[PDB]
Design a protein around this ligand. Sequence first.
Ligand SMILES: Nc1ncnc2c1ncn2[C@@H]1O[C@H](COP(=O)(O)OP(N)(=O)O)[C@@H](O)[C@H]1O
Ligand SMILES: [Mg+2]
Length: 214
Amino acid sequence: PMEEEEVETFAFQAEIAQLMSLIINTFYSNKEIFLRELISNSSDALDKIRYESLTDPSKLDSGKELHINLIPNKQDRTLTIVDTGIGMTKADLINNLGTIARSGTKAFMEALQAGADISMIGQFGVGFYSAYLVAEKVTVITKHNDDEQYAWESSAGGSFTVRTDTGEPMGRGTKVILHLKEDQTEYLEERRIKEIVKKHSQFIGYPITLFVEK
Ligand SMILES: Nc1ncnc2c1ncn2[C@@H]1O[C@H](COP(=O)(O)OP(N)(=O)O)[C@@H](O)[C@H]1O
Ligand SMILES: [Mg+2]
């Protein structure tokens, strides 16, 4: 029986779209910090579970472990960052991942224009968009306790879509799927992934596991 998925399309806020264009079309040293930004986002999302739970018991009754899995797929040329954090409602995806201005965007674009390290992106409140250093398309599957499962997707170019995501239930949390650019396949290598997690992500307070395809 055929599923129906409602799809809505949204313009990125003016400066976020400009930032994405800058990120996409400019060479940066130190691209590898994208992974640090996504793991940090997962970590924040798991912190929120813990604070809902240390503070609102029904959350306590989940049996899911709080964790981050990294899943490179060399066949599909994707890298997926999965967490069991609080997830995002539909409103959350639309508001938080592209329609609302961030006060740091302009200053961050000026800093990059003046040759700052892309690694500074975490301090300007726009760290998610580092995904576009290495990915030509990003899909975010998400499931929050208060909503249905949603998929957000953008190949940049000024808009993104949010749609209900039916079947493949993922349970609470978020999966960010990076469809890597043809020249960024080094981020599918177990040794590369381990290197960058050790160098940039060693104070995450949750277990992170890397799934290596035999
Ligand atoms: N893995 C994730 N789980 C839940 N929400 C996530 C997420 N990754 C990103 N987000 C949402 O996207 C927002 C933007 O993230 P980012 O560009 O890194 O800025 P920041 N300082 O809030 O971490 C986050 O504040 C959060 O609301
Ligand atoms: Mg962040």
